[PDB]
Symmetry: D2
Subunit: 122 residues, 4 copies
């Protein structure tokens, strides 16, 4: 985990994120998107639970990206929840939630759900 999490990751839709896993469970870095009302790099922050593992289990982690930078303000934020699996073909499997700021009347339709798999190879 940590050492193996640090680095560049790519998902199936062409997005990339670079992260540094800090000794005490922190994750900091940037996310560069491929889809959405995104454009350029956005700051990402999150945490991971190291014990993590005498039965080859994954390391649980999560992070958040608010879609605002100096070129765009999409009034939304996405959170990814999943686990890191290391080795030859290390990967981070996640499920995500994207919430948009809405009026109270449209709040029932404010959150989208999806999944993404990230690899060290693109």
């Amino acid at each position: 985990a940590e050492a193996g999490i640090t680095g560049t990751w790519y998902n199936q839709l062409g997005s990339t994120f670079i992260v540094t896993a800090g000794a005490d469970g922190a994750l900091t870095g940037t996310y560069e998107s491929a889809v959405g009302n995104a454009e350029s790099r956005y700051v990402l922050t999150g945490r991971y639970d190291s014990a993590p593992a005498t039965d080859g289990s994954g390391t649980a982690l999560g992070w958040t990206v608010a879609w605002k930078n100096n070129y765009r303000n999409a009034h939304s934020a996405t959170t990814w929840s999943g686990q890191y699996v290391g080795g030859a073909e290390a990967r981070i499997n996640t499920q995500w939630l994207l919430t948009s700021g809405t009026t109270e009347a449209n709040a029932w339709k404010s959150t989208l759900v999806g999944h993404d798999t990230f690899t060290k190879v693109k």
Copy 2:
């Protein structure tokens, strides 16, 4: 947002979290749980998208908590995605994803989904 987000929040199950919304979209603080394989305070980190809003919309935000501290290591992490609505009865409505580290065979059943509403009053 920001100023109105900073402070203590409580949800329906008795959990509490104290957060500080930083000028440039950061959210940092601690979460003290009521349920789970949690015990005491855990560090939380996240982001919010300020524009946020000439049509009284909510401010989108999200944060992560890895369930590890000096008393417990639950090998899991939870991410909350939602929006802040201010005013008299300000609230943060969220949907969350809790992922546990599993072996590859049980990864299909590694993530729980739920929702939580936080208020300034408990």
Copy 3:
């Protein structure tokens, strides 16, 4: 369960659904919405798992509604997953997934997630 599930249910946003729980796990009925690109009644079909329960547990169930009737065709369908809890203040607590038909390029943003609580009283 079954007998206690049969009847009319109302949720917080003003929607209503009438269902009949059949002896062998079937659920059939109609859903009349309050929000969405819905208008009138739609057919609903689903299943419930009866054992259900010497430790007052809920009865797991789920159903689907395709948003097409003789007045509207929203090209979408919603599925509700949850459990029935009987008694004085019986309720059905659910989480739902609403998927819209999209082109392959927008499929990442095709599903919304939410929750609804239904009661016998409106």
Copy 4:
């Protein structure tokens, strides 16, 4: 849709389901699982929204399976929400919710979320 939906489908974990799409939006069939506290075939029921589509969009659909048959009673039900895409390599992409019957104290952890992709080839 309909005609193209009728038939046998397989997902990545080895499960199979046979479905018949009825002229008026109904879906009926059986699901034979590969994972879970499942064993054999279970009845499935659902709906699809036909318009469906002059811009090659998918057909939205959903179905439910209660995990009870003459050999097992797992006290749970799963709902799948997604869309059908036809052609050479037709597929049904879905997100699912699996709810277990729990006591009120564990209801916060009663629902698992995941995704599955089904193809006509296994």
